[PDB]
Symmetry: C2
Subunit: 280 residues, 2 copies
Amino acid sequence: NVKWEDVAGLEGAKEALKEAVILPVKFPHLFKGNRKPTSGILLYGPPGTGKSYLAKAVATEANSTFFSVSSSDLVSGESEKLVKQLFAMARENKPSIIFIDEVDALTASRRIKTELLVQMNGVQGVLVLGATNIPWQLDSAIRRRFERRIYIPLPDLAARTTMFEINVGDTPCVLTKEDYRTLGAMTEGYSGSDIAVVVKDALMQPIRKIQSATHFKDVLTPCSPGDDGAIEMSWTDIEADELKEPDLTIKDFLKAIKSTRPTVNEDDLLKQEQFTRDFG
Amino acid sequence: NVKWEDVAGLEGAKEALKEAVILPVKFPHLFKGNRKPTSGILLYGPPGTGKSYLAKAVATEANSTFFSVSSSDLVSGESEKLVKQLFAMARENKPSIIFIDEVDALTASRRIKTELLVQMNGVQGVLVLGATNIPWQLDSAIRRRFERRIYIPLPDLAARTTMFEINVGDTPCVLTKEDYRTLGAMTEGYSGSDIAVVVKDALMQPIRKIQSATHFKDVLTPCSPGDDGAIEMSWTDIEADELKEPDLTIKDFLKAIKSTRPTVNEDDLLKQEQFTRDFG
């Protein structure tokens, strides 16, 4: 989905991972003696910043193998062994990152928490990135297991532009280069993923219009009851190859943006600012 | 444990894997169109030939990630998910081999068998090597899932020599270069691993002698009741630093070989010769 080449956005973070994650793996011989590399990296920050993609992104650049697992899908009879296998394989596989998403949800589970903490116990070769959107509620112990904390904030007033370019890839449209910028500008305060939902919505407009319509203009494409060829009929009547879906446009996206007020609570985001000052 | 560099032994097999496993991964662009690479490789042959090491060996050379799992340890509440995760990770990780040891033991298990067959279902990127010491008892279906069969026979009248060199590495001794050859020669018909057991035994001799002894000669090291300094006493009396363990020697190994008659049944091995003629 995302390539290191375009992950830049995050200010003082793309960098950190380069140094924190890549630099060691990119020739670790510089880490002999009292120069111990980094054991664990916690990624924490406002929800919907792709932390997951970011992790896979850095890992790929780092040319290490990638093993993710969500705490959610792990806490929710014998999953204690999954964690064993997981580290196991990461262990038995060159340089490897283990991405543990939603570490905060570690605290039918204390077994897992323990298991992990054990598997993390001791551990070069295998990095462990942990993700958390609620870093305070991470267990005192667990938090201790992650040395280098790295903050990953909401998308850059320009990073969004690309993302609009993303969740439309295949999907045909008519957006110009600028238009994405605009759409990026119009989403000040929006979550990198808040985006993707609006774009889902945006995409559905063309067909969504074909449905609720009364008249269709000729060239057939929907239209108003007053127009040059406005024939009162339905899409049901339109030929299998006589239907020209209306084009996608900023309009559509802007309508979406309009009706998709972003999730990130300014007061919430401030609270994460406290963790940075406590464990940054 | 084993490096591709020395795996040669197997006649017309080191080769096959190079071509069967490595050649595709070593630039797969040569496999466009009706040129489909190999889906699954069954390794079958007389027990104790390191098939497991061989698999890891080829995979390493192939520069793919390696994921093993034993059917034994998988058939013996919710392990159905392990297989999912396993392929899952192999899937999400570049070129990768999945090694399924003891496929024969696939036929509380039919769930697994199915699961696997499903996961194998369809599948470039991910090879699957399967190992079996009893290839006939592999399920008709399962066997169908492995296209290229590769036979891996008992060790070469000279391959053994190295292995004797192996299971002694750290362990100090006095074996010359020749002596290993000898030990290799003296194990005609021995299993690559039948070796390792004898060597366990061989290794224990030095201390094993220190124990059962009556007199110790000076320099202290054990000896006969008639000798130049044969003092009637025990190892219990010997000083913490006044004990010279007797040296390891061919003698010891040859005693072992003597008392460690190999497991591979000539008649059994013939039976595997039938599978080669039926599905080779």
